[PDB]
Amino acid sequence: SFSGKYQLQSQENFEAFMKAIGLPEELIQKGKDIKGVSEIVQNGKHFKFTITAGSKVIQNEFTVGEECELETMTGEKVKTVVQLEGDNKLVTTFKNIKSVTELNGDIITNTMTLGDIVFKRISKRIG
Ligand SMILES: CCCCCCCCCCCCCCCC(=O)O
């Protein structure tokens, strides 16, 4: 349902966010303009997602409504719960970051908010 492969079209406030969260500037620099790929496999409430940005491949999984460990941008793994807010929307919060992922047709919009910082990503189905 969320299942598919998607690639980044555009994003806002990437570096603000990534510095604030602790990403090595050596990585935030080379990452600014990468159009990353997301491969998602949803099976009921079971989700697997791989996010590929260059040589950095992060793979995660979670079951909706359960506790799950998620590997973060920095490599830090956090224990949280991901919830559905409608079949088309994934919502979680970790390290004071609120992440919203919403699929509309072939476009996935992801929003992460740390304080006043709103990091938004817009991706498009590919393969
Ligand atoms: C590496 C950061 C982990 C993100 C934590 C969000 C948990 C739900 C995410 C499900 C798949 C995310 C959608 C990918 C779209 C995108 O790359 O912006």
UniProtKB/Swiss-Prot annotation:
As stated in the Swiss-Prot or TrEMBL entry, residues carrying the post-translational modification N6-succinyllysine are 30, 35, 45, 56, 77, 89, 120
Mutating residue 93 to A has which effect?
Increases the binding for cholesterol; increases high density lipoprotein (HDL)- and low density lipoprotein (LDL)-mediated cholesterol uptake
What the entry lists under PROSITE patterns is as follows: FABP
**Keyword Lyase tagged:** no
User: Membrane-spanning regions, if any?
Assistant: none
Which InterPro entries does UniProt cross-reference here?
Answer: Calycin, Fatty_acid-bd, ILBP
Modified sites of kind Phosphoserine: 10, 38, 55, 99
GO molecular function per UniProt: antioxidant activity; chromatin binding; fatty acid binding
Give its localization.
Cytoplasm
Cited Pfam families:
Lipocalin_7 (PF14651)
Q: Phosphothreonine: which positions carry it? A: 50
The family database entries (PANTHER family) matched by this protein are listed as:
FATTY ACID BINDING PROTEIN
Entry's free-text remark on domains: Forms a beta-barrel structure that accommodates hydrophobic ligands in its interior.
Name of the molecule in the record: Fatty acid-binding protein, liver
